[PDB]
């Protein structure tokens, strides 16, 4: 299946519906008024590296002072890729905001420091392949029982607050995923 048809689930965190230049529909945030805090602070800033028609994805966020996450229903077995989109719109030094990302308890991004990787007011994406087969979730060489639901968690550590800007899941493998331009 082509790109839009292969997307099963997609969210614009802290924001409203938006269709990107590839035809992907990022839905309005399902956690509005429920878990965490929305912020549109970045809407005053140009976002580097991103396509300019799609900056609104990175200008809006959900963050929290305690651990929080999204629950995702998955209806069929197969190969999938999770894409997570971030930007740092407040700090401009390393070791100011740092946090882990977990999937069904497996640590899939350790010590994420958005500023250290890309700078201030600049797009950064994490790309995570996975497989769901024979009643099991497989990610980064680890395996556990799958019940029908994925839980995507942003973990509170010692350095400021965990956050996310947008996220989607597509059927396929990593060679099918659009990549951000080389940044440095
Ligand atoms: O919405 C802007 C950012 O809010 C939070 O950061 C806080 C900042 O607004 C200010 O109050 O300073 C404190 C540090 O003392 C920051 O924690 C979010 O954590 C951040 O992700 C937002 O971009």
Swiss-Prot record:
The keyword Ribosomal protein does not apply. It is a single-pass type I membrane protein. GO terms for molecular function: carbohydrate binding; enzyme binding. GO terms for cellular component: endoplasmic reticulum; endoplasmic reticulum membrane; membrane; oligosaccharyltransferase complex; plasma membrane; specific granule membrane. It is found in: Endoplasmic reticulum membrane. Residues 1-184 are lumenal. A carbohydrate binds at residues 41, 63, 90-91, 160. Keywords: Carbohydrate metabolism, Endoplasmic reticulum, Glycoprotein, Membrane, Signal, Transmembrane, Transmembrane helix. The keyword Endoplasmic reticulum applies. Carbohydrate-binding protein with a strong ligand preference for Glc2-N-glycan. May play a role in the early steps of protein N-glycosylation. Interacts with the oligosaccharyltransferase (OST) complex. Belongs to the malectin family. This is Malectin. It comes from Homo sapiens. The chain holds residues 42 to 225 of 292 of the full protein.
């Amino acid at each position: 299946a082509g790109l839009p048809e292969s997307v099963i689930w997609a969210v614009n965190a802290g924001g409203e519906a938006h269709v990107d230049v590839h035809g992907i529909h990022f839905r309005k945030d399902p956690l509005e008024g429920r878990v965490g805090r929305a912020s549109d602070y970045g809407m005053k800033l140009p976002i580097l590296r991103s396509n300019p028609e799609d900056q609104i994805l990175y200008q809006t966020e959900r963050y929290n002072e305690e651990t929080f996450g999204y629950e995702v229903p998955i209806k069929e077995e197969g190969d999938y890729v999770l894409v997570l989109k971030f930007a740092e719109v407040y700090f401009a030094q390393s070791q100011q905001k740092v946090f882990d990302v977990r999937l069904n308890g497996h640590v899939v991004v350790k010590d994420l420091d958005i500023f250290d990787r890309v700078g201030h007011s600049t797009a950064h994406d994490e790309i995570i392949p996975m497989s769901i087969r024979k009643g099991k979730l497989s990610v980064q060489g680890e395996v556990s029982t799958f019940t029908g639901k994925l839980y995507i968690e942003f973990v509170k550590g010692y350095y400021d607050n965990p956050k996310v800007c947008a996220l989607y899941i597509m059927a396929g493998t990593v060679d099918d995923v659009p990549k951000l331009q080389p940044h440095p």
